[PDB]
Structure formats: structure tokens, C-alpha cells
Amino acid sequence: TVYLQVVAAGSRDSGAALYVFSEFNRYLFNCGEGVQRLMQEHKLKVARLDNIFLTRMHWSNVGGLSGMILTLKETGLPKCVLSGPPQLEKYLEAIKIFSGPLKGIELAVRPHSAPEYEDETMTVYQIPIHSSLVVAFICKLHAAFVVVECPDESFIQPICENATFQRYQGKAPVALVVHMAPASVLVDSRYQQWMERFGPDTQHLVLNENCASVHNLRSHKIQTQLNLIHPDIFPLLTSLSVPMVQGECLLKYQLRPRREWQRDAIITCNPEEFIVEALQLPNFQQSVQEYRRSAQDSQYPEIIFLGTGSAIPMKIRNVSATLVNISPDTSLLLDCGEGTFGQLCRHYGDQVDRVLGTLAAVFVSHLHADHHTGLPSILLQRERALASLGKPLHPLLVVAPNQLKAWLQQYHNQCQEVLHHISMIPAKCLQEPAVERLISSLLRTCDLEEFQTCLVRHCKHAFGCALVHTSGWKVVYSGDTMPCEALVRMGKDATLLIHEATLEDGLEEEAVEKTHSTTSQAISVGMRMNAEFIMLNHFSQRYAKVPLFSPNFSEKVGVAFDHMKVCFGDFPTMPKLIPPLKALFA
Ligand SMILES: [Zn+2]
Numbered sequence: 001t002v003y004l005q006v007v008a009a010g011s012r013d014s015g016a017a018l019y020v021f022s023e024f025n026r027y028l029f030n031c032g033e034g035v036q037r038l039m040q041e042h043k044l045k046v047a048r049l050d051n052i053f054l055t056r057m058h059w060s061n062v063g064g065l066s067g068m069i070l071t072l073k074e075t076g077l078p079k080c081v082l083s084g085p086p087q088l089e090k091y092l093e094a095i096k097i098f099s100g101p102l103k104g105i106e107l108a109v110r111p112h113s114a115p116e117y118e119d120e121t122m123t124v125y126q127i128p129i130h131s132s133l134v135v136a137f138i139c140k141l142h143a144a145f146v147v148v149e150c151p152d153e154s155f156i157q158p159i160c161e162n163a164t165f166q167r168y169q170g171k172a173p174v175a176l177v178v179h180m181a182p183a184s185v186l187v188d189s190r191y192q193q194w195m196e197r198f199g200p201d202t203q204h205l206v207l208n209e210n211c212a213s214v215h216n217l218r219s220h221k222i223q224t225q226l227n228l229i230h231p232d233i234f235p236l237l238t239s240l241s242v243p244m245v246q247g248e249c250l251l252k253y254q255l256r257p258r259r260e261w262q263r264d265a266i267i268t269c270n271p272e273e274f275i276v277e278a279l280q281l282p283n284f285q286q287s288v289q290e291y292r293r294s295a296q297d298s299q300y301p302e303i304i305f306l307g308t309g310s311a312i313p314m315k316i317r318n319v320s321a322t323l324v325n326i327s328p329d330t331s332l333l334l335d336c337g338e339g340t341f342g343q344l345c346r347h348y349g350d351q352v353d354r355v356l357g358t359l360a361a362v363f364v365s366h367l368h369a370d371h372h373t374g375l376p377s378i379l380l381q382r383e384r385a386l387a388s389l390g391k392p393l394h395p396l397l398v399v400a401p402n403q404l405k406a407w408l409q410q411y412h413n414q415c416q417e418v419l420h421h422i423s424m425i426p427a428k429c430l431q432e433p434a435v436e437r438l439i440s441s442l443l444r445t446c447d448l449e450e451f452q453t454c455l456v457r458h459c460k461h462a463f464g465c466a467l468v469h470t471s472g473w474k475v476v477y478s479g480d481t482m483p484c485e486a487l488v489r490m491g492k493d494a495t496l497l498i499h500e501a502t503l504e505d506g507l508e509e510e511a512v513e514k515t516h517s518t519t520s521q522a523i524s525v526g527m528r529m530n531a532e533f534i535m536l537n538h539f540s541q542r543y544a545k546v547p548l549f550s551p552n553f554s555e556k557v558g559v560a561f562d563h564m565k566v567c568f569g570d571f572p573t574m575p576k577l578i579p580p581l582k583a584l585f586a
């Protein structure tokens, strides 16, 4: 028995990706960014992913590796094999710069030069195609598959003229064909003469950017339930001669018994059912009523919590990210971990082409897979956004540790040119004139009076930052630290402060043995800093629910959640949301 599934249908927020599995082995195609988030919400059976097949060197195709290697490291999968362009493995020697030279997992890379494979089923054949190089994969069970990627119009003529597909067209039998091509090039005129020759008995699956659907379900559920409390700070999310069907979430297929689709576990959203389920929790409705009665008691500088999790994400909190915007047309992103662009898109919708046009700089605290992975996704999409608005490309300033430049240089030299979108400021120069003038540009582009940095605790070369505006409001971002005096010394009297509750109280021994902070320690550090408001972020990977309360939870403390919005005028009412939230996650 063998099936097939569509992990991602190719929406704007997530690239295309396919998942094949049987009794013996399991496979994966185009492991793009955010793929590891999926396959865990849906509870798909990993633990046997011997092979990964990649159709291009672009980031949207190869972005999910760094997380999938670690996921396989968990559960101890002995080996994995990559297949794709010859430029692989040089991408991989670049990942080891920041991912740490892990030796528990041994892996191999197969270039396009290997034609046969032939291992225990389905006998992958690799088919290189040039325009500048893509590889198409066709598989033959001991039925047949076809998986093709056609990013541009220039690939149509090579694709339709290849001789490899001609011994399966007409009469072999190719059960399916999967296309991942933009809607613009899907029709052409030379095209549709190639997918025709397979005969109408075959069905074609397409994963264009027009594949509108929701791949998460649970995030939307929790967000609507939260919006039940107070809508302003919890906005709702937003998303031929032969037969042809458009791709959806997972879906399903069968090849041997009969070639039939199956909607066994498609995902659907039912806001009203979510609301009625929510209203049955113990004392949730009463708490919301009390809060609404209590509510009877500027908006420009605001912060959006795109991500608040730690370690590999777990379907409720994504890897840490936080957007700070000083005006409707000037912004700043802070940490840029994995999945940032997906969160931004699923938060704003069609305004992303304008929000990306306001970014002025980014700030990565340190080099961990949860803090800098998603930057190239922001850069590439910012390029397109600038193109759509009819303005030239202006490099996006980035403040980062000096060790980040090595990974970017390796990627630039080995996979694709991405370095020309970036202007780098070494974070060391912003703590206690070529880079000085770039610093002046950073300060002037946001009207910030000063930008400050400090070497915080945790691993080597980890930093925090403080931002102070000409209007006088001051916000300090800690990053990952254990209670240290670098904060406070960085400048007290901050209007807002963000700190990490990576652990619950009573685990100070773990907070000492490993460099992370408990909630009580975080609140203590914030109160010593004498900040007007204290905000908790970067939560523990164990629970992902509301934290544990302690006596020191003063009026100045708050609990951050994913996709949440905040303004300086919301502080007097923010502490009053605790009861209904605690009733929600009972
Ligand atoms: Zn780290």
C-alpha cells in the first residue's frame, strides 16, 4: 500500500511541499521554510525519512532543512539522504557554521548524476533541466509518479522537449503529474501540448500561488477564541483538454488499488463552532463578562507579537519574532527567526506588499536556529514588494553578530545571490567612520535619538538592545539572558521592557545549569530596571500555555501571546486580561 499527500498547497505564506509514505519508507519533496511546523500539527508519521528530494536551490525549496535535521536528531533517526542539484552539500557545509557541528546524525548527498537509485520501492529517477538549473523527479513502483517544477517561462521549452518523459507518454502508466508553476506561465502556448500527451486517463495536480486555504486550524481556533475577549488587540487572521485539480491541504491519493483521491483529513475552519466550544469552558464566559464590565474604567508606537516560542515550535507559539513600528510608514523587526514572513502574511493579508515596504532595519540577538533563520525570506519578499510599488531596491540594514556574515557569504557563493540586499552593522559597534555613517542612517531613518547594545549573559556574543525615540518613549529588548546587570546598566526608566520567561518558578537549578531565566527572575530583573511595563516573551517549550502565577506578579506584568497587538495606551487594561485568559487555557 502506498499513498501521497500535499503538506503545503503552495499558498503565498508557504511554498509547495509533498509527502509520500508507505509501509517501508517515507519521502519528502521541496522541504521549504515552515514545513517542519506542519507535519506536526497534522501528526504525520516522520521517524523514517530516509530521503529528501529537492527540485531547486532556491530558499523556498531548501529552507526547512535546518529544522528537519534537528527534528530527526530527536527520536534518533540513524541516517538521511539528500537528492537534488550538485550545489547541495555546499549549502550544507554552510549550515554547520551556525547549527553546530552535530555528529549524532550522519547524512549523504546524491547529485543529479545518479539516475537509478532503485532501493526497496518506487525507484526514483532524477531528471535535470536547465533554463539556472532545476531537476524533475519521476518514480516507478515495483503505476508511476511525476513531479515537476517550472518557476519561469524560460523553463517551458526545455521541459516539453525532454526525452525522458517520452517513454511514459501515450502508453507506458503515469498515474499523476504534479506541477509547481506560477499561474502566469501555467497556460503559455507551448505548454498544454506536453501535459496533453499523457492522455486524459491521467490527472494533473497544480500548486500555484492561487491555492487559498488554511493549513493550521488550531492557530485560527485559538485566535478567534482570544478575539472573543477583546478584538482590538487580537485581530482575526486572514488567508483544458484534460482534467486538472488544484491542490489543498494534505488531501490524499492511492496508486495501487485504484487511482482515487481521498479527503480523509482535510482541514476546515468553523468560527461559530469554535466560539460555542469556547463558551463551555469553566468560568470563561463569566470572566469575559467581568472584564468587559471593568473595561469601562498614543496609538502610533505599537508592537505586534509575531512569535513568542522557544526551541522547535509546537503549533501554538512560533519561533520568537516581534514587530515594532514607529509610524504607519516606518518599522523595525527585531529577531527574525524561522516562519516570520508566514506569520506576517497570515496576520496582514494583502497589506504585506506595503508593510514589507516600511521595514528599515532588523536586529538578531544571537546565532541560534530560532533567531536568524528566516531573514532571507524577508529579504527576497521585500525585493518583490519594492518591485510591485515601483521603487528601487534599498538595502535592508541588519544589526547582527559578526558571525552571521559567514553564513550569508557561504549561501551567496554557493546557492544564490542574496547578499546585495543587506547592509551589515556589527552589533559590537552599538554597545558601551564607515560603519558610523551607516549607524547615523539607521538612527535618522527611524527618528531614534539613540540605539544601544549590551553583551548579555547566555552563550558567546549574545546581545540586547534599547531604543529611545525623539518623543522620549524608550523600549528595551533583552534577548536571551539569565538575570544579569547588563540590563538596568543599559539605561533604566524604559516605558516598556521585554524579557524571557523560558522556565517556570522552582526550576532555578535548571536556569543556572543552562543559561535561561525563570519567570520570577525575569519579573525581578524588569522591576529592578524600573520599567513602566514588563512584558514576558520567549516562553518555555514544555507547556506553551499560560504561565504559572507567583506573588510578585505586580500590576506591571503581562503575558504575551502569538499574533497579539499592543499600544502604550493599553497598559492600564492589559493586567485585567489575566482572569479570562487563565480560564481559557484551563
Ligand atoms: Zn541559543
Ligand SMILES: [Zn+2]
Residues within 6 Å of the ligand: 368, 370, 371, 480
Ligand atoms: Zn533563544
